[PDB]
Design a protein around this nucleic acid. Structure first.
Length: 214
DNA sequence: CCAGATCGTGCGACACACCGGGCCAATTGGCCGATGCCGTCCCGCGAACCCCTCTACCGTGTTGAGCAGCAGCGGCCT
């Protein structure tokens, strides 16, 4: 359902440096976290996609200059979902401070880094791409996909809504059962958004499926 | 041995899923229209600001070294 979509997004080549930085920051913020162990900060990011973890590791090594481990052992323990976990221990504090998770010698930033916000539209769509790669789903249970992506806390969700607005694409933040996400319902916005992210074959398949079924 | 955990199954509740209705709260944000103080400018005079002019006892002076060209001189040549 979404495996092909995320594969296509991961396989998309990227050139501009700022967009790569924004994508890395988004994925780290959404599907990543920090742990203060043995007196040092270690960054752990959990992905459930084959190529996405490699892409994130390569981006870190290239732009931020750091090394990762890329372990395949499942934190869930099932070992069937291939819950990849990429780790950064050497220079973890520097990576955290220079990627936007923590700034001002203070608490972790709830929303997306200020650098990602108030940037070019390319960086906004790159941040949305990273958010979709990290977490999200494409359900199509009934009449609409419900292209929902969950976020930690209202701040990240509303920041994603704001970023989507800059693309002239409708979006809506929602909260249920204490967990909040951003969703877009109408088919036209879904198609335009998926086209902008870079996926092509999945966009077509969805287009014909919707037109034939509806 | 055999009894609760796990799960099957069942009944109900039920938190909303819908996608569609029918009105509303908050909250407007424009400048509408009316009233009022400040920027610009046009003198008005006056302080200063710069230039020009004139004063008639009279009075009359400021190292060493290397290389090259020119002036004076001894001495033929006519």
């Amino acid at each position: 359902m979404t495996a092909a979509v995320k594969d296509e997004i991961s396989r998309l080549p990227v050139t501009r440096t700022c967009c790569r930085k924004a994508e890395v920051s988004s994925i780290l913020r959404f599907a990543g976290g920090l742990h203060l162990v043995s007196g040092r900060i270690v960054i752990e990011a959990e992905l459930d996609t084959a190529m996405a973890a490699r892409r994130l590791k390569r981006d870190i090594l290239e732009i931020f200059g750091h090394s990762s481990e890329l372990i395949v052992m499942a934190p869930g323990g099932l070992r069937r979902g291939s819950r990849f976990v990429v780790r950064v221990v050497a220079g973890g504090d520097q990576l955290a401070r220079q990627t936007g998770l923590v700034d001002g010698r203070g608490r972790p930033i709830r929303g997306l880094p200020p650098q990602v916000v108030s940037g070019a539209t390319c960086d906004a769509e790159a941040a949305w791409r990273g958010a979709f790669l990290a977490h999200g789903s494409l359900t199509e249970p009934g009449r609409s996909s419900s292209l929902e992506v969950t976020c930690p806390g209202p701040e990240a969700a509303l920041a994603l809504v704001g970023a989507a607005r800059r693309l002239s694409i409708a979006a809506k933040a929602r909260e249920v059962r204490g967990v909040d996400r951003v969703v877009v319902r109408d088919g036209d916005a879904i198609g335009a958004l998926l086209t902008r992210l870079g996926a092509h074959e999945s966009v077509l398949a969805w287009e014909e499926r919707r037109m034939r079924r509806e």
